[PDB]
């Protein structure tokens, strides 16, 4: 390029290598979750299990993202990759709280994204964020609303226990 | 028909009709009880299962009924399926509660549809109920209760706690 | 919820659940139109297979819809279930007639909830209509068309000898 | 016996007979219903296949309550076997009419018995009726009378043709 | 070439070019004859499949002549390809007739062309034809003619029901 690039709006390819960064962040975030809840006073295989998982689905996004503004003829451009909002996460509850606002910010960014993509009249753009991320993200934070609704459930008078039963019994493989 | 029917008296016909009304609103009740468990501030999907396949073995047992309407040479008459009795089901031990109550419910209009058919000297529909539909009904209110009992002994005084171990425990695949 | 629930108005919340309504009512009709063609005197099982499986794929799409409506965080809520329009449904010729009429109206309810969606700005919910729905129901009209094309074709002079045909070469497996 | 013989009436026992009497006859004109078909001036090997598997039905009827007769431990008393009441048998129609009017005759002595058996206090002959006979019956009588109306919507202005294709395209194997 | 180039006349490297123009606008024909009878008021699936099949196997023979073309040095001329003469084909005997026609056209070209290869003794062109194109467009033309008489057979005063019969039980796989 500019050899194949048609229809593709400054702007958009602008707000795609923001949005690497925003996932770069998000994947960032998630590896000091899991390894946090790695350490020999927290250990919870579990909770380390949920949150190096989705380190990796983000790292794949931001691929993804990636590799779209190449095929439409746009250029990556990285920025420095600020670190994670906290060193150490508290409980599970804690942390599963964290990843839900995280979550729910990637969400808004990919809505602001389609809706300024619709305005520039970009429908490829729209299908290629409707066909592999805006459904993931819904699902994704159902999934996050599923576990925090059963961590409370279980904080009782015994949080201890809760956090054990929950890790065994919800997330452990 | 009438070139088929043979002892088939007007009144069970009419009971049939009644009976797929009374097991169509108990699938409409199983899928409002199955979605329920499923929201994200409930969250219990091994109750969301148990309620669903309930929803379809209700359905089952009216196509059976509506055969066997067929099969005699009666017409099926359907009616409005009014929506279940409650719009939002509590907890576990609340919805098992209702799953009773509506599981006696059929199984006394069985009843009554077996001494009407007795009283009609109709054996082939004597036969049919006790092959397809009261044994059925016994074992699954047999379950119930049993089930009912396990969540009552959990309730101690940490009622989140015996709410997700029972889900975990009993009644998640 | 209301701990998942972004960019998901009330607007579009109703009426999902009334599309639910929707399906589900042609869900029922479908099953009447089954079990019609099950009579003994009607007795043409390829078009009970035809409308059965419609049920099937009617209830389907409700459920599809109540799965969507918890993973966004609004709130399934459940109406009456009005009976089927007619009791009895006269000829394929007739019963097809009305199914088309009946799947027009479900394509007009999902061209409204998408024009609500694009209207709210609500790229998730377009894509889903999109993706599970629309080119479904295009689908399903185009074949019912077909249908009712043949069936008219076979009406000539000898009305009974063309629907016995349809029924025995196109419907039946 | 007299030795295993218990709860089993002489009026249950003398009707036992009588009903072997019928299916034997059933069966017999099912033989020659069948044969008829096989005849070279009317050739209709879809027909002849139906009625030929309806004569082994009846034996096989016949042996059920022999064998059961045995078990009770009463005697077996065989009479003469009137001939069927037609030699030749007509159109299909005509043939299906006098098959259903056949079984309608069973189905009305198995009613009967079962009728007997009740005033007698015979739960066993009740419940040996209903596993063997009434439901097979039932079924049986709906499939003659889904046969029947297929027929007649066949006849029209070319009644040559309905039969030859109702013989193809439902009876033939 | 013309470093291959060997006894191939420009006459007959004309014709080639000419004939390619002809089998492609043959294909386009079945194009447009198949798309015909797959519109929802026309609806013979065993019509659009013989047709579509058509359009394939004149692709086919254009790119056999084109192979040929540049095996013996001549140049590939390609002219615009003019649309089909209808836009509407009636019923399955109007395409057939029309079908029958078109191939007879294509017949006569080759036999044109054969005449012409044999007059400027080209042996390969005179085998070519005969081993890839003469017996491929007799055995169609049989082909097309046995379905004319079937067609016109089935017309009699029921001319739906031939024409759903022929498409059912001659054409669809
Ligand atoms: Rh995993
Ligand atoms: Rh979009
Ligand atoms: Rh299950
Ligand atoms: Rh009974
Ligand atoms: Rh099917
Ligand atoms: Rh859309
Ligand atoms: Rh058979
Ligand atoms: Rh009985
Ligand atoms: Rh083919
Ligand atoms: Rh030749």
Redesign the pocket.
């Given at each position: 390029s500019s050899q194949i690039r048609q229809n593709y709006s400054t702007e958009v390819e602008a707000a795609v290598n923001r949005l690497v960064n925003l996932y770069l962040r998000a994947s960032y975030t998630y590896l000091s979750l899991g390894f946090y809840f790695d350490r020999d006073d927290v250990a919870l295989e579990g909770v380390c299990?949920?949150f190096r998982?989705l380190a990796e689905e983000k790292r794949e996004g931001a691929e993804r993202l990636l590799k779209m503004q190449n095929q439409r003829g746009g250029r990556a451009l990285f920025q420095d990759l600020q670190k994670p909002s906290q060193d150490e996460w508290g409980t599970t509850l804690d942390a599963m709280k964290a990843a839900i606002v995280l979550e729910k910010s990637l969400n808004q960014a990919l809505l602001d994204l389609h809706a300024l993509g619709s305005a520039q009249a970009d429908p490829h753009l729209c299908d290629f964020l409707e066909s592999h991320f805006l459904d993931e993200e819904v699902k994704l934070i159902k999934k996050m609303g599923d576990h925090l609704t059963n961590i409370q459930r279980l904080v009782g008078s015994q949080a201890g226990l809760g956090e054990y039963l929950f890790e065994r019994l919800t997330l452990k493989?």
């Open positions: 299990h949920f998982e493989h």
